[PDB]
Amino acid sequence: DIIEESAWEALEKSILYYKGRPVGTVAAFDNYDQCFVRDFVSSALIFLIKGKTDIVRNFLEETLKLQPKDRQLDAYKPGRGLIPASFKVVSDNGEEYLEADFGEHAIARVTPVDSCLWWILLLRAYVVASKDFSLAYQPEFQTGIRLIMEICLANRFDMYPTLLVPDGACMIDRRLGIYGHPLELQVLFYAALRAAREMLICQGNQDVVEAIDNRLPLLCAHIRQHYWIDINRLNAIYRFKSEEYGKAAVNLFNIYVDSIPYYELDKWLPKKGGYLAGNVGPSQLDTRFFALGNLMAIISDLATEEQSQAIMTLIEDRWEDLVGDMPMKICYPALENEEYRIVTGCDPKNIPWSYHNAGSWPVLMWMLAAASVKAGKPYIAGKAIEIAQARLLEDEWPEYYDGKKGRLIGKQARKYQTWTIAGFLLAAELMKNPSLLSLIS
Amino acid sequence: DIIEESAWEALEKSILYYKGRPVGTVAAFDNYDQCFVRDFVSSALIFLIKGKTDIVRNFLEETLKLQPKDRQLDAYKPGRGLIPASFKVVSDNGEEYLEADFGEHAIARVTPVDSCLWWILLLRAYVVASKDFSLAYQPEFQTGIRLIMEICLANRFDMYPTLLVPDGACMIDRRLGIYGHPLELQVLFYAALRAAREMLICQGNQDVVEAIDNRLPLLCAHIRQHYWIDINRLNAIYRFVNLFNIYVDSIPYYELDKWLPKKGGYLAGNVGPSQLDTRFFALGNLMAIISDLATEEQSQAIMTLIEDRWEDLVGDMPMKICYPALENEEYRIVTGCDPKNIPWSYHNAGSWPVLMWMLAAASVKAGKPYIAGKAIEIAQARLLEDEWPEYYDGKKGRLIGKQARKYQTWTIAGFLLAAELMKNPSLLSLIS
Ligand SMILES: OC[C@H]1O[C@@](CO)(O[C@H]2O[C@H](CO)[C@@H](O)[C@H](O)[C@H]2O)[C@@H](O)[C@@H]1O
Ligand SMILES: OC[C@H]1O[C@@](CO)(O[C@H]2O[C@H](CO)[C@@H](O)[C@H](O)[C@H]2O)[C@@H](O)[C@@H]1O
């Protein structure tokens, strides 16, 4: 009805032009010249679906040129192979050019890792939508893919098959205790490894293609075995006799059982529910539920079929906790009290049930839809869309919502947030046509 | 004297042999075949002081061979350029060989970063003691230094001049909230940068030598500005443009104001976006004085703090590895309820006699050797009696550590080294 029409009209106005050609979308239409890579994913997929592919092509070509190609030994300059979080059009010189934001002057001088992984997934989306892999096989694209894989695969100090990162290195780009091996990045890493293997010419690239082939099954089993939480699993951990000869090594990360909030999880988890943990590392298990990681795990077949149904069962049965009045919680539960202070450093923006700290993010509804369709329960997404439809247009498409139920328009939420609009539309498109999953799986 | 002679005898026994020549010392003499790089530092320095340099030369050569030379894309294999935390002699096969431990089957599959930085500092110590840079100028050693500098300098995701690391990546090799930019590693990185600049030939190493020269003053200024804690700084945080957004509610600011003397201060345990770790870490602060990372005024202010809060930082056993202990929710959240690191035990503000040598070195450097003198007198009163334990527990370090090994080599070496540095201040040239 009028809701979808208004969304389309809004999405159109968000398009960003460079040298007269569309090169992405702005984060929120009112800088006026700023495209975020992660934000562009939902817009991009819509445009692909609607056959307007040139915007995506131009985005991929332009961002590829922004990727640092050489090893970087100097402070405050981006690491080799990274994709910037955002870029903008600088019209101030006689001629237009693009300026990358790698975070060099940001409040955290960290380059988020998700952008380069989404870039690969977008590249695959484009070639599948175009029914033509030619772009990907061009030498500059082979190089781009290869460099991203190298920085992700190469071991530095940490040798787990997962990707080790500083805090605030993904969609959650502030301090939320997601340093280490956060789920979001491992899941994207897995999906990107799969996508890169489909598009890389193996000849000449033997080292990297081999490393990709070696990493995929190790990373899959690692995540399935060491991130999976359900009631059976938690009880098995508690009864596990670690002192017995040869059983210590089973507890790979040397998790101490006393650290797990059993009472609260036992209560929260449905009988047949479960999910992948937010983070796992030495003496570290973050039992927060993170939506993006869990939903993307379903979409990429990282989660087993049984795990996927368990995740969907959790979402259905704890619908009020995870969706409430606005799909959906970025994570659950909130860090509060002492834990909030220690983990976030008292970040004012990240107070309990706000923003990154278990705020509700409409954009996540596109992945909820994709996952629901993939899991054969598309009615779950339908229900989420109905809830969103009730308030998004009236509220002028906010970036996020706050509170345990997502009742409040986010404390500092921008209006006409593009991924809120695109997330909404994309969810609806995936419902109408489940076969569109092939763009992202 | 008698006590030194007694320590010396214990130290001689800890020597590890490989193919009939000394290649290091074991961590605690009774594995019987195992040498830890960081533990060996105090042993090595004593041996250098005593003119027994071949053990250190052999140690350096053999650990250099254990360094991975190429890029590593496989899981559970060590990163390029790293030095293993420890090695052991396997005499089980026909002919003895060395086996590196990079943490591949450890409870934390993380290769500690401090080992490679100590290796650089030991190399310099050796060529200074030998008055000959020949060993360091050999191509394989030039390569060794370059690789270490490359892996530390190279930005991955984090672009600060500091070194970004996982938790448990140094002497504290368990989870203690020292992920990010912990002081210990920043100070050792700084110290290793200085030593690498002094030993790397510019020709053939142009990119890395320039990057070292650029990083040095930037890292120096970064630490001096952003890690420094004193009354004035706390008030500035309270009144907060700045590089780091630090929110004052995140730190115990009224408590710190009370703890700090007027002319006291120290370098913070960790600094990052929305992160200021106000714990005092001893190794980091003492090595910062020794390496001239801390300014003269900061050095005196650290010494003023140690004197004035002696009961807290030294107590009955010099000296606390950090202060204060993580307790209550902080302990549970930060350590993951690690039973070994309970408050006032082991890494969690336990008392580690090894730190004595750095207290001595820093005290001499700051022209206040009587500070180390007082610590030595206390340590002397208990270490020989207790047979050189690894660590002590309790708010005042009164208890022998529950799992402390006796005849812990760096406790013995640390004590002797402290005494040597007191007798001969110019020996500081070995470590700075
Ligand atoms: O308002 C943009 C500003 O917010 C930050 C900090 O959270 O990032 C947020 O906004 C981005 C653009 O919409 C999102 O991609 C990101 O997930 C979200 O955290 C800053 O990074 C950015 O400068
Ligand atoms: O007993 C050796 C065993 O102890 C650990 C515990 O973390 O490390 C400690 O002992 C090492 C050897 O003396 C020290 O170098 C280290 O600083 C200390 O934490 C294990 O890593 C090691 O396997």
- Only one residue has tokens 């993170």, namely A290
The DSSP symbol for B306 reads H
Rounded Cα gap, residues B122 and B129, in angstroms: 10
| Resolution of the solved structure (Å) | 2.0
> From the alpha carbon of A39, which atom of ligand 1 is closest?
15
Question: Measured from the CB, is residue B36 less than 6 Å from ligand 2?
Answer: yes
B118 touches ligand 2 (CB under 6 Å): no
* 3-class DSSP state of B307: helix
User: Contact A110/B273, CB-based, under 8 Å?
Assistant: yes
Report residue B375 as tokens.
């610590």
What would the two tokens of residue B385 be? Answer: 């009696």
Ligand 2 centroid – CA B215 distance (Å): 31
Neighbours of A77 (CB within 10 A): 12
- What's the CA gap between A12 and A8, in Å, rounded? 6
How far is residue A389 from each of residues A2, A4, A392, A395, A401, measured CA to CA in Å?
Answer: 11, 9, 6, 10, 14
> Does B39 contact ligand 2 (Cβ within 6 A)?
yes
Contact predicate A201/A190, CB 8 Å: no
Instruction: Give the Cα separation of B380 and B386 in Å (integer).
Output: 10
CA distance B130 to B199: 14
Nearest to B180 among A79, A166, A284 (CB): A166
Contacts of A105 in chain B (CB under 8 A): none
Query: Can you give the three-state secondary structure of chain A, one letter per residue?
Result: CHHHHHHHHHHHHCEEEECCEEEEECCECCCCCEEEHHHHHHHHHHHHHCCCCHHHHHHHHHHHHHCCCCCCCCCCCCCCCCCCCEEEEECCCCCCEEEEECCCCCCCCECCCHHHHHHHHHHHHHHHHCCCCHHHHCHHHHHHHHHHHHHHHCCCCECCCCCCECCCCCCCCCCCCCCECEHHHHHHHHHHHHHHHHHCCCCCCHHHHHHHHHHHHHHHHHHHHHCEEEHHHHHHHHHCCCCCCCCHHHCCCCCCHHHCCHHHHHHHCCCCCEEEEEEEECCEEEEEEEHHHHHHHHHCCCCCHHHHHHHHHHHHHCHHHHCCCCCCECEECCCCHHHHHHHHCCCHHHCCCECCECCECHHHHHHHHHHHHHCCCCHHHHHHHHHHHHHCCCCCCCCCEECCCCCEECCCCCCCEHHHHHHHHHHHHHHHCHHHHHHCC
3-state secondary structure of B338: coil
Chain B residues in contact with A249 by the CB 8 A cut-off are 105
Hey, what amino acid is at A172?
I
Of B269, B120, B128, B142, nearest in space to B203 by CA: B142
- Can you name the residues that pair with A98 across neighbouring β-strands? A89
- Residues whose CB falls within 8 Å of the CB of residue A276, separated by 6 or more in sequence, listed in order: A183, A187, A223, A227, A228, A229, A293, A294, A297, A303, A307, A311
Which residue in A111, A159, A344 is closest to B76 by CB distance? A159
Q: What is the largest CA-CA distance in chain A?
A: 73
CB contact under 8 A, B247 and A71: no
Beta strands in B274-381 (DSSP E): 275-281, 322-323
> B263 to chain A, minimum CA–CA distance in Å?
27
How many residues can be counted in chain A? 441
Cβ-based neighbours of B68, under 8 Å, separated by 6 or more: B77, B78, B79, B80, B81, B82
The residues facing B28 across adjacent strands are B408
Segment (H or E) for B152: helix B139-153
Compute the distance between CA of residue B288 and CA of residue A299 in angstroms, rounded to an integer: 50
Count CB-CB contacts under 10 A for residue A407. Answer: 14
Number of H helices, E strands in chain B: 17, 11
Q: Which of A73, A155, A256 sits opposite B207 (nearest CB)?
A: A73
Length of chain B in residues, anyone? 432
Residue nearest to atom 17 of ligand 1 (CA): A171
Residue partners of A85: CB distance under 8 A and separation at least 6: A36, A37, A38, A101, A102, A103, A111, A112, A115, A173
A208: nearest CA in chain B?
B73
- Cβ partners under 8 Å of residue B93, min gap 6: none
A32 burial (CB, 10 Å; 0-12 / 13-18 / 19+) is exposed
Residues 6+ apart with CB under 8 A from B205: B142, B146
d(CA A373, CA A396): 27
Q: Cα-flanking dihedrals φ and ψ of residue A345, to 5°?
A: 65, 30
| Ligand 1 midpoint to CA A414 (Å) | 11
Which ligand is closest to the CA of A359, given by its number? 1
Cis peptide before B356 (omega within 30 of 0): no
Min Cα–Cα distance to chain A from B73, Å: 5
Contact B156, A151 (CB under 8 A): yes
Please name the residues in contact with A262: beta carbons below 8 A apart, sequence gap of 6 or more: A234, A238
Nearest to B115 by CA among B24, B197, B226, B46: B24
Determine the distance from the C-alpha atom of residue A379 to the mean position of all C-alpha atoms in its chain, rounded to a whole number: 23
The structural domain count of chain A equals: 1
Whole-angstrom CA distances from A277 to A109, A113, A184, A280, B108 are: 27, 19, 10, 7, 18
Question: Residue type for A357, please?
Answer: N
CA B171 to chain centre: 6
Give CA–CA dist A35/A42, Å, rounded.
12
Report yes or no: B384 and B6 within 8 Å, Cβ to Cβ. yes
Nearest-CA distance B274 → chain A (Å): 5
Tell me which residue of A198, A218, A196 sits closest to A149, measured CA to CA.
Answer: A196
At A217, list the tokens. 């099954």
Which of A77, A157, A288 is best to mutate for the B interface (most B CBs within 10 A)? A157
Sign of CA dihedral A421, A422, A423, A429: positive
Q: In whole angstroms, how far apart are CA A213 and each of A193, A206, A226, B80, B225? A: 8, 10, 20, 21, 46
Contact B110 A157 (CB under 8 A): yes
Residues 6 or more apart whose CB falls under 8 angstroms from that of A207 comprise B73
Q: Are the CB atoms for B323 and B287 separated by under 8 Å?
A: no
With the C-alpha atoms ordered B193, B198, B201, B207, is the resulting torsion angle positive or negative? Answer: positive
Adjacency order of strands within the sheet including A331-332 = A228-230, A274-281, A284-290, A331-332
Which one of B173, B178, B281 would you pick to mutate in the ligand 2 pocket, going by the greatest count of ligand atoms within 8 A of its CB? B173
Ligand whose nearest atom lies closest to the CA of B347: 2
Beta bridge partners of A314: none
* Domain limits for position A233: 1-441
Q: CA of A15: how far to CAs of A8, A42, A249, B123, B279, in Å? A: 11, 13, 53, 58, 49
| A167/B272 Cβ within 8 A | yes
Nearest-by-Cβ selection for B164 from A102, A166, A342: A166
> Phi and psi for B7 in degrees, rounded to 5?
-65, -45
Q: Which amino acid is at B117?
A: L
Q: Which residues of B touch A150 (CB under 8 A)?
A: 71, 73
Contact criterion met (CB below 8 Å) for B92 and B116: no
Q: Which own/partner contact pairs does B372-376 have at CB distance under 8 Å and 24+ positions apart?
A: B372/B418, B372/B421, B372/B422, B373/B422, B374/B310, B375/B314, B375/B318, B375/B319, B375/B418, B376/B318, B376/B415, B376/B418, B376/B419, B376/B422
Contacts of B291 (CB under 8 A, 6+ apart): B187, B190, B191, B194, B432
Is B123 strand, coil or helix?
Answer: helix
Pairing between β-strand A15-18 and β-strand A21-25 as defined by DSSP bridges: antiparallel
Residues at CB less than 6 angstroms from ligand 1: A 27, 36, 38-39, 171, 173-174
CB neighbour list of residue A26: distance below 8 Å, 6 or more residues apart = A14, A16, A32, A33, A34, A35, A418
Contact between A118 and A63 (Cβ < 8 Å): no
Cα-based distances in Å from B225 to A58, A172, B217, B278? 43, 28, 12, 14
Q: Which atom of ligand 1 is nearest to the CA of A417?
A: 13
Distances in whole angstroms, Cα of residue B103 to Cα of each of A271, A388, B111, B113: 38, 49, 6, 12
Could you tell me the two tokens for B148? 């270490």
**Cβ contact (<8 Å) for A166 and B157?**
yes
| SS3 of residue B312 by DSSP | helix
Q: Give the whole-angstrom CA distance, residue A100 versus residue A106.
A: 12
CA distance B100 to B83: 9
| Ligand number nearest to the C-alpha of A41 | 1
3 state DSSP class of B359: helix
